[PDB]
Structures are given as structure tokens and as C-alpha cells.
Amino acid sequence: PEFFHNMDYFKYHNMRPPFTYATLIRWAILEAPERQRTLNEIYHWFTRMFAYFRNHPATWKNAIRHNLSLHKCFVRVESEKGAVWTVDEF
DNA sequence: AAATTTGTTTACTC
DNA sequence: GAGTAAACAAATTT
Numbered sequence: 001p002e003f004f005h006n007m008d009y010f011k012y013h014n015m016r017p018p019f020t021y022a023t024l025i026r027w028a029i030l031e032a033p034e035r036q037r038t039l040n041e042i043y044h045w046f047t048r049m050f051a052y053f054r055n056h057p058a059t060w061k062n063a064i065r066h067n068l069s070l071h072k073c074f075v076r077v078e079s080e081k082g083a084v085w086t087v088d089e090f
Numbered sequence: 091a092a093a094t095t096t097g098t099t100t101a102c103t104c
Numbered sequence: 105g106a107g108t109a110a111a112c113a114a115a116t117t118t
Contacts, residue, residue, distance in 0.1 A: 020105090020106065020107085021106075021107075022105095022106080039095085039096060039097090040095090040096095059108080059109090060107095060108095062108080062109075062110085063106095063107070063108070063109095065095095065096065065097065065098090066097095066098090066099090066107090066108085066109095067106090067107095068096095068097075068098095069096095069097055069098050069099080070098085070099085076096095076097075082116085083096080083097090083115080083116090091118105092117100092118085093116100093117080093118070094115105094116080094117075094118085095114105095115085095116070095117085096113105096114080096115065096116075097113085097114070097115080098112090098113075098114090099110105099111090099112085099113095100109105100110090100111085100112100101108105101109090101110090101111105102108090102109085102110105103106100103107090103108090103109105104106090104107095
């Protein structure tokens with residue numbers, strides 16, 4: 001099922017985070033010191049930061065792509081090293 | 091020139 | 105609106 005109580009960032013039990021894809025991505029982008037990440041770094045962040053997402057990659061990688069291009073507060077910016085995603089706080 | 095990842099939509103529940 | 109699934113197209117690497 002989903003999270004049994006109020007426990008904080010324990011990523012060590014395969015339990016669904018009680019957060020939207022829209023908001024998890026927003027948090028992953030703002031974690032980077034430059035406030036941007038590549039799509040792969042977002043994939044690495046999700047797996048690293050939650051045990052639940054280590055089991056069915058195709059199910060949620062599709063979701064992450066979907067949310068990025070559906071919400072106006074996610075913006076793609078071309079960099080020297082390639083495409084990255086940023087967040088419009090407004 | 092594929093192959094494959096990375097971006098956009100659309101639609102269907104709930 | 106959120107999560108999921110999918111069809112289809114763009115941009116990017118083998």
C-alpha cells in the first residue's frame with residue numbers, strides 16, 4: 001500500500017511516496033546546486049531517493065516524461081552539455 | 091541509418 | 105487535477 005504513518009525521508013522500505021510526480025520532480029530540480037538537471041539525473045535521483053521506484057522503471061519513467069511536458073512550471077533549456085530541465089517558481 | 095532515448099499530446103478513470 | 109497507459113513524433117547516440 002502507501003506510507004503507514006508520518007515517517008520522513010526513509011527511502012529504504014519499498015513504500016509509495018505520498019507525493020505527486022509534479023512535486024517530486026520540482027524537488028529533484030531544486031536539489032541540484034545550479035537548479036537544473038538532465039532527465040537522466042532525474043531518473044538517478046528518483047531511484048536513489050526511493051526504494052519503491054527501483055522495481056518497475058518503465059511505469060514511472062513514462063510518468064516523469066508526461067508530467068514534465070504537461071505542466072507549464074517545467075521548462076526545457078538547452079545547455080552546452082545538452083538539454084536540461086528547470087522550474088518556474090511563478 | 092538504426093536505434094534509442096527524450097519531448098508532446100490525447101484519452102480514460104477515479 | 106493525478107496517475108496510467110499509449111500512440112506518435114523529435115532530438116539524440118550507437
